[PDB]
Amino acid sequence: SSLLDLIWLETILPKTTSFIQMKMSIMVSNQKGLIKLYFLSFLITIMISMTLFN
Amino acid sequence: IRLQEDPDPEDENLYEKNPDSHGYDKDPIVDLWNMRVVFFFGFSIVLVLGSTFVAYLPDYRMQEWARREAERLVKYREANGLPLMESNCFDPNKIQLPE
Amino acid sequence: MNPIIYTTLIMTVMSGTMLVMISSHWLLIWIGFEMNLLAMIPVLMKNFNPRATEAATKYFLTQATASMMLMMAIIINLLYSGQWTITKMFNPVAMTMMTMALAMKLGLSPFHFWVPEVTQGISLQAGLLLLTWQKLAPLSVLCQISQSINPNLMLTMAMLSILIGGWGGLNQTQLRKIMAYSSIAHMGWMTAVLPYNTTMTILNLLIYITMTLAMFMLLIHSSATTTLSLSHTWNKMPVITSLMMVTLLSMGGLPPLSGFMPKWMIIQEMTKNESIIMPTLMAMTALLNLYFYMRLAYSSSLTMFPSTNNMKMKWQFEHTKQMKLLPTMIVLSTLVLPMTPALSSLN
Amino acid sequence: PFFDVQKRLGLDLDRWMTIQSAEQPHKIPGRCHAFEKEWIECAHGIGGIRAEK
Amino acid sequence: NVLQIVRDHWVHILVPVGFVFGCYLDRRSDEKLTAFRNKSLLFKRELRPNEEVTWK
Amino acid sequence: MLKIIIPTTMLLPMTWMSKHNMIWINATVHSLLISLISLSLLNQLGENSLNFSLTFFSDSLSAPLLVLTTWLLPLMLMASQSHLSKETTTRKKLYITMLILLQLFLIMTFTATELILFYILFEATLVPTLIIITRWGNQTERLNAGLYFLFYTLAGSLPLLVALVYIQNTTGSLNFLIIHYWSHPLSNSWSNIFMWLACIMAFMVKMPLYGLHLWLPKAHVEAPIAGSMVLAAVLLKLGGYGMMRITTILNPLTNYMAYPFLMLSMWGMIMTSSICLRQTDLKSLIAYSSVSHMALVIVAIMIQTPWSFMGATALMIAHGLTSSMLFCLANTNYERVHSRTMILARGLQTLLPLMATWWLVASLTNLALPPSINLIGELFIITASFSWSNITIILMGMNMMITALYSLYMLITTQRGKYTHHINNIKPSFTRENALMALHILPLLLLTLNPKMILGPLY
Amino acid sequence: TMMSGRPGRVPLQFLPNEARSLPPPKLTDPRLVYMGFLGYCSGLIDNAIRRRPVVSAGLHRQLLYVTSFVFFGYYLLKRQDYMYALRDHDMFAYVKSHPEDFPEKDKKTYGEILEEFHPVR
Amino acid sequence: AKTLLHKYSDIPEGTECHRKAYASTSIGGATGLIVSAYSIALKPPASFLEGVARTGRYTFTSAAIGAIFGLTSCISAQVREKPDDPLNYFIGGCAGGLTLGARTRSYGIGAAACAYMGLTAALVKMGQLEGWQVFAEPKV
Amino acid sequence: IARTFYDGPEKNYEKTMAILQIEAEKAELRLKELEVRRLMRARGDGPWYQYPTIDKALIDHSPKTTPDN
Ligand SMILES: CCCCCCCCCCCCCCCCCC(=O)OC[C@H](COP(=O)([O-])OCC(O)COP(=O)([O-])OC[C@@H](COC(=O)CCCCCCCCCCCCCCCCC)OC(=O)CCCCCCCCCCCCCCCCC)OC(=O)CCCCCCCCCCCCCCCCC
């Protein structure tokens, strides 16, 4: 009950996935809303799409 | 307190207002008729009628048909000296094996 | 803003989109894009405040850059073929420029930031019109030029869109930002199916437009722009919350609701072309969208949040303005799964 | 996506400008009028795939 | 009176009429699958003098 | 099947148009009538299925599940009217509407003839269940329980959708009859391994499989009584029905791919019985008993012999009835004392005699007591597993011993002993509760009388 | 775009003249009845949103909802049936014209076909 | 990118372990460079030296993961004499995950990365064997 | 019971035959449609996947300023 059901079967599948999704969501949505920053990102994306996609 | 919240109400007992309560409804007449219809339909109709209907369902699984067919085949085969259970399901003449 | 000026600006936006969708010439398509943007800026800035001004500024910068790149692609294509007709593009570099420009116009990742920023900045009516119509036009251009789309680039941008939409929507609390990230994810799905069946792209567009119209009009009806503002709606008009809950379930792709049909048809079509990894990843990633839809539904309908004291006066008063086609949008966004084979009519 | 209002109504809004072999003012010929005419005539009515092949 | 009874107990016929309609629709669905009627190798037989079909 | 589908879709307007005090009476009466009508589906053929039309068909595996669903609806109505007395009329009608929609989806799920229609319906069953749980649950954890249930089921089922559309593109049809007649062996390759995994994992999450089961205690503990009754009685049987249906096309790869699932099922059966031994909550004890029995059914389906399939079907029906009865009894106790702790209320045999009798009968059926259909199914599964290998008997014997231990432990803790002194609100049992227990228990004994009706097509 | 650009296709034509040779949908079609059901649901939702009695008020409005939905549904069904008939026609014509691509195959009975047997034990 | 992938694939699976390690290290370095470029774009550094330090850290982490993966997979296939076996790629993926955990100083990150990267690498090997394609060419 | 509620086995048998025939015809049609779509998209010689080309009615054949077109 304690070691497997309440702890490790919770940690492997549902808890780890939820933690990963929460961290990725924080990373994606934590933006300062600066046009300078995301336009520099646009420039990098344009360069990458030009060079790596033939 | 952090809210204007109602106090948790006391448990309501159906036996206090209606000593002969069946536990279905507050209104005595509705409660009595709910009991009557539930008991009648469920027990009488469903239990008795469905059980007897299932008991006397026609033998569509062909259990007795299969038993009679097996009796006939056993009689015919042991009368003529043939094996009771055939060795092959299909005909090796009609089966063509690869070279 | 004068009502006549507002209606003529809306007519000009629609005229620009229609010029894009009827033109057979690249110059006329570009003219339609320019007309749409020019008439769309004041619509964003209709209710004047610094947030609206900032949103309009960012929208203008992004759309102007996209138009410049698109015209560069048109000129490069003319250089190597001497053709102005909108068909398969004859230069791969021009095609890549066109694809990136149209992706930036649509808000596909990694060109997505402006979508949540602008949607939060502008009002509910402005956000509704933005999402719907401004997705409508570039998708038509992409459908016309579909046969020369680089599948690798298009599918990469689509998968990025789905992932980014899911994660952003997970983090957000503002309803307009939630709707923006939902739009990003749905655009990802549409452009993912784009290189295979433009009919499936159009079907996804129509279902998404119906669901978005229903959701935005429910938000306008309840006058809710945040989660907690939406949490008080059960105490004034509980029916609106029930309709919003079923619409949110539909947007998450739950069967047998209408939002399952586009996902189902797109997965089927992609699997017909021997795509399995992409449909499986796309299907699994939509669980993030469903999670934040469900989190929004818990606050509004399935649980009762605390209310305030002036809600009694709000009870005493009655809603005046009538939303146009809201019941029709709510029905079409939840109960059209049995009518699926009409996509042949849409063909 | 593409609503061919021009073809449906018999109008001409940009088809005059689509190609350089069409009617030009004062009958000024293009630089590659003959080649463009030959390619268009070859590729007419067979579709994109057969046109490219 | 009697009018109030029907005003309240007109809903008790909904399920029975639904059952009747369902039986009718089952018959209608059966009558469209009469493509191998009296044509299976196992059950093919000559029609009786006063019957048109083997089953309905 | 329309003669059964349409009366439910007529239960809807009748419920919404009936008077404020006649809703329960009308719903119960007409649900019982629909159950009586659905009893006519048990007349099956020995050769093939009942092919009603191009859309719905019935077999010896579908018929008992349909009868169980239709019989289960009125019992849920009785329990709901127990615990929803102070609700408004509109919310009562919405509750009945959710129950009716769930029953309709389950009926069409069991009678669907295509795998894709089956998928659509068996995924549509989630919405009413989620709404019921997260809306009419009592405690705080209902929201987390709904999230766990929903996302487990969907993460299982989406690869199933991809695999189904792939199989249709490959073979031309998803019709069950066609794929049974045009079945071809599955070669041992990675692609076939992953198709097998997609289908089986969807239904294993629905079962549930040990290690994929936490959503079951979460949802069953936190759902209202009707939600708990339907979740254990019927919704756990969708996974078993799906596995008994899809494994037609997964051979011979099932011979090699079943080892991890068989080991998981056997060891998790032991583990969940042991967990039941040390549970402080009654609903959690019942939920883990459900997990153990469904693990046994998974073993039966995976070993996949004609003797195992009959055992699987019999055990599914028996577990549905027994778990529903146990949940109802626990709910009556909860309504007495407003708590789920097992040791809070004791001496309920000296305070409530007939309820003690019902507890005894339900606990006796929960363990395999002959000649109950529970024992019939468990014994068939054990025999097939013995023919499979000769240490499965060791595992099954351990499981039976622990099952008896925890069932009788629950009975002794709740009923026997001395009553708690300060609990003085234990009113005499209601006729409604007693009738509910009787309607749970009598059909089980009648099924024991006639056991060939629930042994599946392989009989 | 599969059937876009098909030869002889008149632009912006919801239903061409060649669709008149197909059987029109029956007025009692289950799909038409479902369109009517959608219209009725829309009317009920309209009453609920405007806070009128859901089943009683606005009978004329509910009738208009149902009628409009049935009208558009009838025309939509006609177009859908025509498009599917067109697809079948094109597929059959292509199979007929490409016999080397769609060759008839000799049918071998199961007595001649060899299939491996995998025991279950 | 395509050239680097083609070089890695053109090196035979069971031989030239140093060449496999070099190719995988180059791929990892390019991936880390792209990630560092995006990180600098979206979260600007406080200084040029801090930006260069972050770029070096990301690039070295990626290159180390690639080198460990390539070395472990090639060595495992060579010693087991079993090319076209997903187990080699699983071992390489878990070794890369352990490298990531060591770089980030986190046992939990290391374990999760080992599991996920091992599954991903095994899936990549199975796809190479079976002809699975992520961006399928349009047809039908 | 058999007289009142149920029908003979022939009805179910022959309905099953009709259902199987319909489903087999549908499966054959689906596979054939997939093959036809694949060939038409690959080759471009059928009514489907006919992407537009420039109309030759636009070309001006009147004599130009320069003799060599
Ligand atoms: C009927 C079966 C339907 C099956 C599904 C089909 C699709 C839906 C049906 C179409 C839409 C119906 C109207 C929706 C709004 C209703 C509002 C309302 O109060 O209604 C009460 C209304 C009567 O009350 P009233 O005195 O007029 O006004 C009371 C106030 O509204 C009282 O106002 P209030 O302030 O007290 O309201 C508070 C209440 C307000 O709550 C509501 O308004 C809930 C209902 C609306 C929610 C959204 C409905 C569905 C919209 C489409 C979405 C997809 C549907 C399918 C989903 C599948 C998966 C779940 O809020 C709550 O209770 C909040 C807590 C619960 C929230 C969580 C649960 C949400 C469930 C959402 C899904 C429900 C689906 C089933 C439909 C249920 C309603 C019929 O009753 C009806 O409208 C009954 C339905 C119509 C019956 C027509 C009968 C005609 C004559 C017999 C025909 C026989 C058959 C024909 C053939 C001929 C045979 C002879």
Ligand SMILES: CCCCCCCCCCCCCCCCC[C@@H](O)O[C@H](CO[C@H](O)CCCCCCCCCCCCCCC)COP(=O)(O)OCC[N+](C)(C)C
């Ligand atoms: C003598 C003169 C008589 C004239 C008679 C009138 C002739 C027709 C006039 C049509 C109206 C005038 C033009 C106004 C716009 C026309 C729009 C429509 O008619 O055009 C058709 C378009 O019809 C619509 O596409 C079908 C609408 C389908 C609506 C439902 C979509 C299906 C959703 C699936 C679920 C359904 C749920 C239930 C829905 C209620 C076909 O046009 P087409 O040139 O070829 O399109 C080109 C673009 N393509 C190729 C990419 C497609």
